[PDB]
Amino acid sequence: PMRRKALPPRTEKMDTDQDWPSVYPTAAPFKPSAVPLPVRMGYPVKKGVPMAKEGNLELLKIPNFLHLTPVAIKRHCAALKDFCTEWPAALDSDEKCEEHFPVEIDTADYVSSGPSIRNPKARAVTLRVKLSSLNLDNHAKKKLIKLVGERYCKATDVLTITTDRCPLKRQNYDYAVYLLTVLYHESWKTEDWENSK
Amino acid sequence: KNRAARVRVAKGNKPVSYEEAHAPHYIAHRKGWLSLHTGNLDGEDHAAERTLEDVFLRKFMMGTFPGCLADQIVLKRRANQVDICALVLRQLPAHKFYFLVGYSETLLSHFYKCPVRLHLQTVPSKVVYKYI
Amino acid sequence: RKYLFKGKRLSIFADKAFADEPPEPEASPSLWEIEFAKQLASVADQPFENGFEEMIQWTKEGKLWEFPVNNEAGLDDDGSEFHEHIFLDKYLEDFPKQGPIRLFMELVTCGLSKNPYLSVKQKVEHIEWFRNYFNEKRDILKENNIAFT
Amino acid sequence: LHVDVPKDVTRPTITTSDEPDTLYKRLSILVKAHDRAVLDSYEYFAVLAAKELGISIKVHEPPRKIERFTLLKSVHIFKKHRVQYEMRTLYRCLELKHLTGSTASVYLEYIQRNLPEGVAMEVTKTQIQQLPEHIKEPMW
Amino acid sequence: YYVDWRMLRDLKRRKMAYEYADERLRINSLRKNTILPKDLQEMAGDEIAALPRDSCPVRIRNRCVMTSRPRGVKRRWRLSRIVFRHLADHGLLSGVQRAIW
Amino acid sequence: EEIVIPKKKTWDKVAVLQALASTVNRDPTAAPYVFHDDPYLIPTSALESRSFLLAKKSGETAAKFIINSYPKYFQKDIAEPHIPCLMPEYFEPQIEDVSEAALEERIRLRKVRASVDMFDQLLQAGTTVSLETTNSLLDLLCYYGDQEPPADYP
Amino acid sequence: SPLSEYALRMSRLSARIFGEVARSTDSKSMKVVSLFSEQPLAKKKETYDWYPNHNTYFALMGNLRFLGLYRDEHQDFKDEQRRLKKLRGKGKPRKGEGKRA
Ligand SMILES: [Mg+2]
Ligand SMILES: [Mg+2]
C-alpha cells in the first residue's frame, strides 16, 4: 500500500490563449496548481530569492482579483446591461433636478462581514428641501423658519429633517414626509396670538 | 528581553516557516494577517464575536485534521460566507480528506448558521523558510 | 413516410376546448403528489458546475444574503406604521385627563415614541403596566387628592 | 473549449414593470479597509464596471484614520514598560451620479458581491422625488 | 464548564438583569421625576429595593471571556491584555498591528 | 415640460448570478467542480470519482447525525435573516395526548407504525376521526406499503 | 433675554409638531423620557451575550472526542497523567471515604 502520488499541476495543460475567466469564474483562493504564473512572495533571505507559489501562505493570505480580470469585467458588464434603465435625458444638470424634483431623500446601506445583516444606522432617513421650491407666502416663510429652528440654513436656504426615532427605514421615511406636510400647512395657518409679535 | 511570538535561535538545526520566522513587529510589514474580516475597521461592530469564532475555528481544524496541518489556517469572511484555507500535509489518503471536508463544513455551517467552505492545498511536506 | 405528426391518431379523446378546468391544488398536496415532485427535481439534479451555480442554490435556500444588501431584509415590525409608533396618546384615555398622573404619563409616552428598539406591542405593554400600578395605589393617591379611574 | 461550445445560453428574465423608477441624483460608496492596495484594485474594478454600464463616477481618498491604544507588556508589575497597538482604516469614495433605481441595484449587487474580504461598504443613496401632492397646494 | 466559579456567578447576574430589566425600568421611572406624589415615590423606592440583588445591573463585571480576568479587559474584544497580546502578536487579529510612530 | 421617468425593470434575486454564470464556460483542464481542486485530491480513475463523492456524502451524513442527535448544542441562532435549513431537525412526535390532532402530527411526520397505533387507540376510545384525516393515514400507509420510511442510522 | 408670548407659543407649536416635550419639565423629570427612549443596559446584546456558551463548546467537543471525529491533545495528555497517578496510588478518593472521617 504505497502512498498516493499527486498528479502534475494542471497549469501544464493550460494554453497561453485560454479562456481565463472560465478558469476563475468566481472569487476563490489562490491555487498554485491553477494559476499559470511564476509568482513569488516573501521577504527573501540573504543570498536567497522570494519564496515560490507552492506552499506559499503569504499568497494565500492575499485577497486576489484573479476572478476579476479586465476581460471578465467587460464580459460581465455586457450581460448586466439589460438590467440597467436610462436616466431621463432632460435632467442634464443638478439645477434642472431641483426644479422638477426639489425633495432629496438620503438613505444609507451598510455592508459588513458576519452572520447578521443588521446595522442600527440603516434606519435613519434625511429629507432636504429648499424653501424656495415650496410655495410660501411672506408670512408662511417666516413661520416655517421659526418653527424649524436650526434645521433651516439661511446661507443655503435648505430645510433638513432627520428622522431616526422609528425602528424601520420605511417608517422613518414616511415620518419625515409627514413632518414636512404639517410644517407646511401649519406655516400657512395664521393664529390670533401671532398678531402680538 | 522580548519573548512574544519569537522562535528563538538554536544551533542552526531548527526549521521555521515564513510565519514563524518573523516577530510581531513585522506584522503588516513583511507578513500579513491570518484572518480578514471587517470587524476591526473604524465604526464597525462585532469584533468580539468574530474574534471568538476565529479562536474556535482554529482549535476545531487542529483536532479535525490532527498532524495534517502544514501551517496556520487562513480565515476569510465575505458577507456571511466563511472560507477556511488550510495547508495540509499529504499524510492521509485522498478519500479521508473528502470525508473530513464534508463533515467539517456541514458541522460548522449548522453551528454558526453561515455557509462555510473548506479550501485545502496539499503540500508534500512542511515548507522551510530558513534554518535557525 | 414515418411522419411524426402526420397520420391517423387514436381519436379516443377530443380537442381540449376546455383546459385545466379543475385547479391543480384540488386538495392540499398529498403524500403522493409531494413525493412525485421530489422525484421530478432529482431527474434534473446535477452537481454544481462553478461557484455561481453554488451561490444560486444557496440564495434560493436563504443561506446566502440577497444583493444588493438590505440591512432590514425580513425585518418588519408587525407591519406597523410611523403614526402607530409616534402617536401613543390614544392609550392614555383610561388615565385621568388632567393632574399629576397625566403629566407623568405624558413624559412616559413621549419617550416611548422616540424608542426605535421597541415594537408597538411592547410599547403598549409599558403603558398597561402603569394603568394597573396606579389602580393598585388608589388609596394612597386619594390621600394626595389624585383620583384615578 | 475548442470545439464544444454552448449554443443558446439561458439568460435571466427581466420584466419591465409599470411602476415609475427611482431617480438617484447621487450615490456615494465609501469602502473601508486596512490595506491600501486592496482599495486600489477594488477602485479599478469598480470604476471599470461603472464605465462599462454607462454610469458617471468620480473617486477620491478621504483622509485615513489610525486608532492607537496602549497596553501593559508584562503579565505582572513592570508598569513603565508598555506595548502599543494600532488599527489603520483607509477609505476610497466612489461618487456616482444620475442613476436610475434599476441601474443602481444591478451595479451595487455586482460590486458588493465582489467585495474583497476585510472591506466594508457604506452606500449613501440620495433619491430625488417630487413634492407631496398635499403640500403642492396650500389647503386651509 | 465556564472558566471559573467567578465567571459563573457573573453569567447568572447577566441573565437575571435581563429578566428584571423592564420591571426595574418601570418602577425606577416612578422615582426619577418630580411630578408624582412623594408617597408613591417613597413606596416605589422599596419595591425596587425588594427585587433580588442580582437583578441590579451594577453588579455585573466585564471579565475576559477566555480567562475570566476581572481587570485589564478591552471592551471591544472582551479579552484581557494578556490574551489580546497573544492573538495580536501572532497575526490572528484582523487589522491589529504594533504601533510604530 | 414634465419629465418622463423610466419604468423600473424587475428581476428575481438570483437573476444577476444567472447572468454572470451565462458568461463563463466549462474549464477544459479542470476536474468537475465537486472534486477538490488539488493535485493530490483530484480523482484519477472513475472508481475514485465515485468513492471520493461517497466519502463526501458520508461525511455530510456524519455531521447531520451529530446535529440531529445533540440538538441542544446547535440551537443558538446568530444569523439575520434567519436560515431555517441550518437548524436541527426533529422527526419524533411531541404531542403526547391521544387525539385526532396527535394522529395528524404522526401522519405529517410520516411515521407509519406509530400512527396506526394511535388510530386504533382512537377507534378503541371511539372518538370521531375526520374522513379527510382518515385518508391522510391511508395515503401514508398505501404509499409506503405498511413499512416504516427507509432511513440510515446506527 | 426673556421669551415673549410669541416666542413661547411658537416653541410649543414646534414641540407639538416634532413630538418633543411640550410642557415646562424639570431636569429631574426629563429622565423619564430618557429611560423610555433608550434601551436599558441589561437589554443590550453586548451585556446579556457577553460570554460565549462555554458549556456548549466544552460539551460539544467532548462528545466529538468520544465519537472519534475530534482529537484533544490536552485531554489525552491529562488522561495519561491520571492513569499513571492511579498506578502510583495517588488517585482521587471516593466521596465520603476521605482521609478525615
Ligand atoms: Mg480554575
Ligand atoms: Mg463595576
UniProtKB/Swiss-Prot annotation, chain B:
What UniProt keywords are attached to this protein's entry?
Mitochondrion, Ribonucleoprotein, Ribosomal protein, Transit peptide
- Mind listing the GO biological process terms from this record? mitochondrial translation
Gene Ontology CC terms: mitochondrial inner membrane; mitochondrial small ribosomal subunit; mitochondrion
Q: Does the keyword DNA damage apply?
A: no
Listed as disulfide-bonded, the cysteine pairs are none
Give the location in the cell: Mitochondrion
- Tell me a Gene Ontology molecular-function term this record carries: structural constituent of ribosome
Q: What is its main location?
A: mitochondrion
The organism sits in which domain of life? Eukaryota
Any transmembrane segments, and where? none
Q: Quaternary form?
A: Component of the mitochondrial ribosome small subunit (28S) which comprises a 12S rRNA and about 30 distinct proteins.
Q: Which family does it belong to?
A: Belongs to the universal ribosomal protein uS3 family.
Its recorded name reads Small ribosomal subunit protein uS3m
Native source species:
Mus musculus
Provide the gene name from the record. Mrps24
Q: Which portion of the entire protein is included?
A: 36 to 167 of 167
Curated annotation (Swiss-Prot), chain C:
Q: Which family does it belong to?
A: Belongs to the mitochondrion-specific ribosomal protein mS31 family.
Q: Which cysteines are joined by disulfide bonds?
A: none
Q: What is the source species? A: Mus musculus
Q: Where in the cell is it found?
A: Mitochondrion
* Quaternary structure and interacting proteins, as annotated: Component of the mitochondrial ribosome small subunit (28S) which comprises a 12S rRNA and about 30 distinct proteins.
Q: Which residues of the full protein are shown?
A: 236 to 384 of 384
**Per its record, how is this protein called by name?**
Small ribosomal subunit protein mS31
From Swiss-Prot, chain F:
Look up keyword Ribosomal protein and say if it applies: yes
Residues modified as N6-acetyllysine are 72
Q: What is this protein called?
A: Small ribosomal subunit protein mS39
* Family recorded in the similarity comment: Belongs to the mitochondrion-specific ribosomal protein mS39 family.
The main location is mitochondrion
Briefly state the protein's biological role. Answer: Mitochondrial RNA-binding protein that has a role in mitochondrial translation.
Q: Where in the cell is it found?
A: Mitochondrion
**Segments annotated as PPR repeats:** 95-129, 130-154
One molecular function GO term is: rRNA binding
Organism whose genome encodes this protein? Mus musculus (Mouse)
* Description of how the protein assembles with itself and partners: Component of the mitochondrial ribosome small subunit (28S) which comprises a 12S rRNA and about 30 distinct proteins. Associated with the 12S mitochondrial rRNA (12S mt-rRNA).
- The portion of the full protein included here is 56 to 209 of 685
Swiss-Prot record, chain G:
Q: Which ranges are annotated Basic and acidic residues under compositional bias?
A: 94-101
Q: Which UniProt keywords are present, listed alphabetically?
A: Acetylation, Mitochondrion, Ribonucleoprotein, Ribosomal protein
Superkingdom of the organism of origin: Eukaryota
At what positions is N-acetylserine found?
1
According to the record, the residues making up region (Disordered) are 80-101
Q: What compartments host this protein?
A: Mitochondrion
GO biological-process terms attached to the record? mitochondrial translation
Main location as per UniProt: mitochondrion
| Signal sequence interval, chain numbering | none
Q: Which GO terms describe its cellular component?
A: mitochondrial inner membrane; mitochondrial small ribosomal subunit; mitochondrion
Biased composition annotated in UniProt, kind: Basic residues: 83-93
Give the record's family classification.
Belongs to the mitochondrion-specific ribosomal protein mS33 family.
Instruction: Spell out the subunit comment.
Output: Component of the mitochondrial ribosome small subunit (28S) which comprises a 12S rRNA and about 30 distinct proteins.
**Protein name as annotated:** Small ribosomal subunit protein mS33
Organism encoding this protein: Mus musculus
Q: Lineage in the entry? A: Eukaryota, Metazoa, Chordata, Craniata, Vertebrata
